[PDB]
Short mmCIF file of C-alpha atoms and ligand atoms in Angstrom, two decimals:
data_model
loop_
_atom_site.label_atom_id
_atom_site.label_comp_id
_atom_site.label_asym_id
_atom_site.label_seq_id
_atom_site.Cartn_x
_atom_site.Cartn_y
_atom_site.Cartn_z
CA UNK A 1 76.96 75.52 143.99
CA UNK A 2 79.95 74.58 141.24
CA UNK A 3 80.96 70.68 142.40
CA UNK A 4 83.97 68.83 140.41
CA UNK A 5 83.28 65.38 140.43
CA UNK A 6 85.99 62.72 139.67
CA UNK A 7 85.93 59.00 138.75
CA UNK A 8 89.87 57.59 139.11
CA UNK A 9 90.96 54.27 138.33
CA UNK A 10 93.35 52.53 136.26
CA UNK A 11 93.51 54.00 132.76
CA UNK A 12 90.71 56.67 132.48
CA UNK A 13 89.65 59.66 134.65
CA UNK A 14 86.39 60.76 134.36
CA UNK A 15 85.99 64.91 135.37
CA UNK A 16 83.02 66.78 135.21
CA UNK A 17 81.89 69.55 136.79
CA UNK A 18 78.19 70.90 137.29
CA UNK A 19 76.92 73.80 138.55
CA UNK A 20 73.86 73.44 140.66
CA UNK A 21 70.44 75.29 141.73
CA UNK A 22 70.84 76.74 145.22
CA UNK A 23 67.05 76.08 146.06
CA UNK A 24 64.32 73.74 144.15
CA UNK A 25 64.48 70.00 143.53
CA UNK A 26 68.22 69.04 142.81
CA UNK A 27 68.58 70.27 139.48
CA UNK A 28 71.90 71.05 137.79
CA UNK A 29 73.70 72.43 134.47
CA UNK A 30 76.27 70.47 132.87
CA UNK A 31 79.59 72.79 132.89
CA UNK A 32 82.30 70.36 131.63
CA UNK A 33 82.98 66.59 131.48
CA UNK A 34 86.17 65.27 129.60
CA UNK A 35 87.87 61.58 130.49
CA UNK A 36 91.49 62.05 131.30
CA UNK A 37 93.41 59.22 129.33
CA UNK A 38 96.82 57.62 129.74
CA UNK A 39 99.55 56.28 127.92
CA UNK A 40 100.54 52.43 128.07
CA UNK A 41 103.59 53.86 126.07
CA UNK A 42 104.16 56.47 129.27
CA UNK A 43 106.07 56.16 132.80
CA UNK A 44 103.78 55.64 135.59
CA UNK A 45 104.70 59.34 136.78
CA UNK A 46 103.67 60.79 133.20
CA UNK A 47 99.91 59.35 133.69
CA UNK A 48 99.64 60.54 137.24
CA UNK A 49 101.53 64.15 135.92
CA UNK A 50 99.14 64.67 133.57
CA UNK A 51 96.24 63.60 136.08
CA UNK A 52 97.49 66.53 138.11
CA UNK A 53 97.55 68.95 135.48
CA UNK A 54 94.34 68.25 134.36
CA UNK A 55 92.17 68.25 137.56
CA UNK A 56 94.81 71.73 138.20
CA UNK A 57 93.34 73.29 135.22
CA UNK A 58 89.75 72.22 135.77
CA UNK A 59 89.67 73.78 139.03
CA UNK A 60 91.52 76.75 137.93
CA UNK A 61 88.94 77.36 135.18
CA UNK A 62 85.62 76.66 137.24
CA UNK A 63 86.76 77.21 140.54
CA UNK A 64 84.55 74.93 142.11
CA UNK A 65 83.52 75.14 145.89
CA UNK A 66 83.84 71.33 146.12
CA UNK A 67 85.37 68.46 144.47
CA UNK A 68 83.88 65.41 144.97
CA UNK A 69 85.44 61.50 144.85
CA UNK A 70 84.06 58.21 145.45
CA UNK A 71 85.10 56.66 148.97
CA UNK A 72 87.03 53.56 147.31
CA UNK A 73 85.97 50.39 149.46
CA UNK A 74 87.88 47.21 148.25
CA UNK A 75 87.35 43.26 149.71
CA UNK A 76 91.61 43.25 149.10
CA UNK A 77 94.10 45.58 149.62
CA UNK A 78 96.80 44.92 147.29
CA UNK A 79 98.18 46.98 143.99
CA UNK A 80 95.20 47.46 142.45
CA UNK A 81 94.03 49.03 145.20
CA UNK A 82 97.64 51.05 145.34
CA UNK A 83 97.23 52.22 141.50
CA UNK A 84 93.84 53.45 142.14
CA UNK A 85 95.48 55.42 145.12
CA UNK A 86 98.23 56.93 142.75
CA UNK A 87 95.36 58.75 140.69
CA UNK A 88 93.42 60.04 143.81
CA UNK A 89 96.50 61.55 145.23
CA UNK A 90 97.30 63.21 141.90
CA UNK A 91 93.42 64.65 142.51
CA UNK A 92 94.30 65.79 146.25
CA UNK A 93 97.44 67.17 145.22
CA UNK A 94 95.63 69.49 142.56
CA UNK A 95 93.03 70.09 145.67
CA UNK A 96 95.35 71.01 147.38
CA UNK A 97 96.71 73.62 145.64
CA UNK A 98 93.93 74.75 144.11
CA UNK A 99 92.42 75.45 147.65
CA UNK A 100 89.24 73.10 147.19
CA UNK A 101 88.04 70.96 149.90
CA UNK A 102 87.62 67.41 148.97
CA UNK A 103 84.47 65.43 149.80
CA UNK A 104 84.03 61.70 149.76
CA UNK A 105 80.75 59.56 149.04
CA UNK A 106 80.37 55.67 148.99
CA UNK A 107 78.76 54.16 145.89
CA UNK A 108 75.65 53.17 148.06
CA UNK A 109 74.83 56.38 148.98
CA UNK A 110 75.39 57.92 145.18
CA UNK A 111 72.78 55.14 144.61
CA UNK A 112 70.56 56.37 147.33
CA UNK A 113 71.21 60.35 146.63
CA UNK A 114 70.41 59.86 142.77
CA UNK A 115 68.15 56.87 142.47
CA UNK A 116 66.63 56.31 145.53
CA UNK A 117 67.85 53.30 147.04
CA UNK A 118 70.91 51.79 147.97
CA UNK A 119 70.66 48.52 145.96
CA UNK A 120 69.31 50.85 142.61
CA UNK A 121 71.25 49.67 139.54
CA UNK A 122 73.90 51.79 138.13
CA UNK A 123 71.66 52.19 135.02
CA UNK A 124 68.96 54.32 136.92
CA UNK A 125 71.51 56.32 138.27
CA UNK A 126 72.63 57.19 134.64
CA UNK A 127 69.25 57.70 133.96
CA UNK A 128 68.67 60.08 137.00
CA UNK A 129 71.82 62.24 136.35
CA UNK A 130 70.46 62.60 132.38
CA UNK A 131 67.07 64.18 134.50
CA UNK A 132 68.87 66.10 136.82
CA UNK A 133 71.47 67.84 134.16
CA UNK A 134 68.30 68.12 131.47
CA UNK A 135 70.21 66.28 128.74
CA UNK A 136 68.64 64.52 125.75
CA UNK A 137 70.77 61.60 125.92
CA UNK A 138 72.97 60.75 129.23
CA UNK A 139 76.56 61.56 129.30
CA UNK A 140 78.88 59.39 127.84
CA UNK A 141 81.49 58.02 127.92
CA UNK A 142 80.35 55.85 130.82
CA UNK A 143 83.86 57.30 133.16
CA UNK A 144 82.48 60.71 132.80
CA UNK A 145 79.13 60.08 133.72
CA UNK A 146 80.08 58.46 137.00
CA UNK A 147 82.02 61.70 137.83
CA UNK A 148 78.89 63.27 137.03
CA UNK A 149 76.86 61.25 139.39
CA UNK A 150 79.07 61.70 142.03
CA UNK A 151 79.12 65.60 141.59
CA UNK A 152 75.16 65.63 142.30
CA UNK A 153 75.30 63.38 145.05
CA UNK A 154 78.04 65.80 147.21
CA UNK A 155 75.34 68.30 146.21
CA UNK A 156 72.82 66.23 147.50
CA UNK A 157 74.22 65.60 150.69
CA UNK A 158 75.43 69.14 151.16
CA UNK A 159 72.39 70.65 151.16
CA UNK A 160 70.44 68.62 153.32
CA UNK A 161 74.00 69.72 155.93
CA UNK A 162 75.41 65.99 155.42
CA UNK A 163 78.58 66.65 153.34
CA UNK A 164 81.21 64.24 154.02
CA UNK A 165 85.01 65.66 154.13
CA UNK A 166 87.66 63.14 152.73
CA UNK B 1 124.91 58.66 141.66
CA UNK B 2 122.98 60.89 143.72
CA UNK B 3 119.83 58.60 144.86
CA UNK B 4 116.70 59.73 146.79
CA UNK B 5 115.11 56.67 148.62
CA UNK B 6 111.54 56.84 150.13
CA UNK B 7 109.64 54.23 152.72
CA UNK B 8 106.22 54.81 151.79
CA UNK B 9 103.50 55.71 153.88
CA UNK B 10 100.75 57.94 154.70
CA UNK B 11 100.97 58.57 158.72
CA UNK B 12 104.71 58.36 158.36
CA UNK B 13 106.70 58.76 155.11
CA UNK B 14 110.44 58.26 155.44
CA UNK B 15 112.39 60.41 152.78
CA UNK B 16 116.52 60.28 152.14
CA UNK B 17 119.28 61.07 149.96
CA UNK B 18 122.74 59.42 149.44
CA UNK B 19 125.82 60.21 147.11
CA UNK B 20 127.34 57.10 146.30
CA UNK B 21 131.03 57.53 145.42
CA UNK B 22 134.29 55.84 143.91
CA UNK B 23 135.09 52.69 141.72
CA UNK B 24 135.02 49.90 144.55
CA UNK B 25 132.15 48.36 146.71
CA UNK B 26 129.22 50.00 147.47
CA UNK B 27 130.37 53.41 149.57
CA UNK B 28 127.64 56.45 150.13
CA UNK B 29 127.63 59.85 152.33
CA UNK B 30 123.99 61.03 153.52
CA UNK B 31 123.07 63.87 151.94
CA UNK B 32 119.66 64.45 153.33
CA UNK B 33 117.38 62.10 155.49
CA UNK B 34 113.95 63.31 156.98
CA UNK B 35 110.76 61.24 157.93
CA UNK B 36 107.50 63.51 156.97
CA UNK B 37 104.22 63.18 159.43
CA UNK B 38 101.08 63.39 158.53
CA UNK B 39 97.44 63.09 161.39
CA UNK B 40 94.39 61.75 160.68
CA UNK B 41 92.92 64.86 162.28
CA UNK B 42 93.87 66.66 158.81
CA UNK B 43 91.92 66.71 155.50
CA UNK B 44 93.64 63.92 152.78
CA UNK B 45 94.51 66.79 150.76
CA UNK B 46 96.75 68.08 153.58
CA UNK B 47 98.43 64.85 154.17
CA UNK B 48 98.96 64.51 150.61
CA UNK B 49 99.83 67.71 149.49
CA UNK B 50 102.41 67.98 152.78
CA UNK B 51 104.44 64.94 151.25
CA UNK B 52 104.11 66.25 147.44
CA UNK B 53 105.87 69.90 148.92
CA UNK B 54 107.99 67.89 151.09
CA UNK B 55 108.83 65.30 148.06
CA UNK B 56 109.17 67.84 145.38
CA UNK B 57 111.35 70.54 147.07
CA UNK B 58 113.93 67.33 148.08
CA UNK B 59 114.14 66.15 144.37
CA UNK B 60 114.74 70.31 143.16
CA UNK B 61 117.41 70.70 145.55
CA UNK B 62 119.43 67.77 145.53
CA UNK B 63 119.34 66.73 142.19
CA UNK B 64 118.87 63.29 142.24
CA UNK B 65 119.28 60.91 139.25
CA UNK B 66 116.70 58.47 140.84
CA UNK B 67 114.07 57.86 143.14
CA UNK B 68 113.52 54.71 144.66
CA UNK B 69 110.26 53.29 146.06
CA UNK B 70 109.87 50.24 148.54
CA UNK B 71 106.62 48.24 147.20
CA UNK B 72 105.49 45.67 149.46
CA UNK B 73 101.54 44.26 149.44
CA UNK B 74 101.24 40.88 151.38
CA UNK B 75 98.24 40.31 153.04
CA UNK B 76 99.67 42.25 156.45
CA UNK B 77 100.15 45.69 155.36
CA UNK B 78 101.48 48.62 158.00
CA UNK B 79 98.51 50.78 155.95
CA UNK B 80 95.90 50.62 153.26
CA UNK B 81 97.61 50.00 150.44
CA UNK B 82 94.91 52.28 148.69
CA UNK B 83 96.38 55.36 151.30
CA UNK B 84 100.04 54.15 150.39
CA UNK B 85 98.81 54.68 146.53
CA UNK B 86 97.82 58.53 147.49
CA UNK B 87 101.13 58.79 149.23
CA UNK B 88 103.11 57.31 146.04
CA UNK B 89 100.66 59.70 143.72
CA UNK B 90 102.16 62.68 145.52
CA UNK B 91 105.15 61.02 145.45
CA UNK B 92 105.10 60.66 141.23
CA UNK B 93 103.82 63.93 140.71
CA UNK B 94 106.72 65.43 142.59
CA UNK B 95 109.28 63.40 140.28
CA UNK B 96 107.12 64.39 137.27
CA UNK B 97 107.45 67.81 137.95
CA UNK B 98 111.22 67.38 138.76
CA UNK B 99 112.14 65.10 135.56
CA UNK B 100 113.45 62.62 137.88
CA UNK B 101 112.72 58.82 136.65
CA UNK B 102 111.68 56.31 139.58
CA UNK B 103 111.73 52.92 140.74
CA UNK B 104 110.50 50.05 142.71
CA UNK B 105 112.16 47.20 144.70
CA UNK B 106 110.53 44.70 146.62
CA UNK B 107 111.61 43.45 150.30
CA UNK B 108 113.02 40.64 148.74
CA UNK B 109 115.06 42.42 146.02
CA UNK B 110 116.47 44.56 149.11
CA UNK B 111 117.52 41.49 150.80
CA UNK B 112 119.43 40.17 148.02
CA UNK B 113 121.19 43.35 147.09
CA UNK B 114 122.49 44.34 150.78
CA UNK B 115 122.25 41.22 152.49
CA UNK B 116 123.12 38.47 149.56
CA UNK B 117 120.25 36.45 149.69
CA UNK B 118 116.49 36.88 149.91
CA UNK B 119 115.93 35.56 152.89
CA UNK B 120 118.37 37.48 154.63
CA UNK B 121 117.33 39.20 158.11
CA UNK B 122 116.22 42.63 158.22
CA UNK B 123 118.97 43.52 160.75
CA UNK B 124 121.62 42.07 158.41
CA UNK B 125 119.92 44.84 155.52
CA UNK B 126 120.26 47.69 158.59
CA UNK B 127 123.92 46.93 159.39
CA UNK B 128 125.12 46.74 155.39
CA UNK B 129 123.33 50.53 155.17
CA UNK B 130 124.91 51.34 158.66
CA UNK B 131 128.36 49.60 156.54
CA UNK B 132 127.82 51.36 153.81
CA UNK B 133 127.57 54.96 154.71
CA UNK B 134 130.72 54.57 156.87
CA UNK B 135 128.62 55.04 160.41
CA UNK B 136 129.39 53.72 163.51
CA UNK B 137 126.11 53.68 164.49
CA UNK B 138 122.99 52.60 161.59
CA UNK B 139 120.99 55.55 161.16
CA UNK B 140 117.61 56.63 162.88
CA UNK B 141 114.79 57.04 162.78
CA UNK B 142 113.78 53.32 161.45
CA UNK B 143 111.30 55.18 158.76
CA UNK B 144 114.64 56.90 157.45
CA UNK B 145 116.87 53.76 157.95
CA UNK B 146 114.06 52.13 155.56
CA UNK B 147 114.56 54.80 153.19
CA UNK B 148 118.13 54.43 153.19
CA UNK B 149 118.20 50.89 152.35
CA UNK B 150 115.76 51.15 149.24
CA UNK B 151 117.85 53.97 147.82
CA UNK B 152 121.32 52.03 148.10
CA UNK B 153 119.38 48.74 146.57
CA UNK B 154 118.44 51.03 143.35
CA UNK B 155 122.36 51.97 143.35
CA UNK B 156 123.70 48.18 143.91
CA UNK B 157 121.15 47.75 141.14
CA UNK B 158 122.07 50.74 139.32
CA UNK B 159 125.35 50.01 139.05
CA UNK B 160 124.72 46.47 137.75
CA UNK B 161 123.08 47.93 135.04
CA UNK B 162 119.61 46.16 136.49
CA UNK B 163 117.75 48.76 137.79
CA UNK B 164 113.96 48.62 138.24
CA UNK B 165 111.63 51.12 136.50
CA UNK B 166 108.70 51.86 138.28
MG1 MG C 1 108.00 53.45 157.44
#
């Protein structure tokens, strides 16, 4: 199972993409993880273009079965929330076109998928994704581990039959 | 001045396109004017990537020298500001793709441009954009009409030498 995972936001993307064991304990090798980066310097459209372009290529070279995004909860809607939005529909756009379905995952259950619990801290998960991909040191920076995490917990879910489309 | 004017939304994105013409007040013919529809039945990526196609294939054919975005986030919102953002990311890949720049107005700044004054009544914005493109009737639907009136503020704007980059 090849899974793209993706970590938006404001100025970085994280993409990574692992391929993992079809049987066993979920256990995974690291394929590719890069942090897309934008421009202050840019137009808004230039940092979602080349958003596109890179999550295009990254599916184009992998081919993944699934890409895999954080479901984005926020306390206020407002334009942070919007600007986040920008990024993931540069993602679905590239999804779209690349013919990958697109699965979503709150960041309780990537918690509870990769560390156990829902209320685990974010630094076990980092520490559980370092086990699961059988790296010496955990992924860095910390933008592509989180797209990391999220890969492994779609793959999680999936094979236990509890995917969740976006 | 060829202007393409959108009324962002996810469920319902209003889309038009106005020539504005001649060296007196503020005179346009409708080039184009569609509203696309997305369900909640569909994966994101199919909403998304319906209003990139839809987007994109409007900004190759006409040729427009802008696009112009309504941005609104009060506390009442028609739709998650965070779906609006993957609506506008489809949106800014399209005019990446197309070399078109973009920009934003705010309800206020429409009020001000078509109706004089910021306060001004939505119905006194609908019946300047009715005034404007020479119609004896203001044009439907109201996702269109809203689409209309952000495109001719960019021109007011435009031809003040004020516009707003996005
Ligand atoms: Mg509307």
């Amino acid at each position: 199972m090849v899974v793209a995972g993706i970590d938006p936001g404001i100025t970085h993307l994280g993409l990574g993409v692992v391929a993992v064991e079809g049987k066993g304990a979920l256990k995974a090798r690291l394929l590719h993880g890069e942090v897309v980066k934008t421009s202050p310097q840019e137009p808004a459209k230039e940092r979602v273009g080349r958003i596109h372009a890179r999550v295009l290529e990254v599916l184009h070279r992998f081919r993944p079965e699934a890409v895999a995004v954080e479901e984005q909860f926020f306390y206020r809607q407002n334009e942070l929330a919007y600007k986040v939005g920008w990024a993931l529909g540069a993602v679905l756009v590239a999804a779209f076109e690349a013919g990958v379905p697109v699965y979503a995952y709150g960041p309780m259950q990537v918690k509870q998928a990769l560390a156990g619990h829902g209320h685990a801290a974010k630094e076990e998960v980092a520490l559980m994704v370092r086990g699961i991909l059988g790296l010496k040191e955990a992924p860095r920076p910390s933008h592509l581990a989180d797209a990391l995490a999220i890969a492994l917990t779609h793959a999680f879910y999936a094979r236990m039959g509890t995917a969740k489309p976006l």
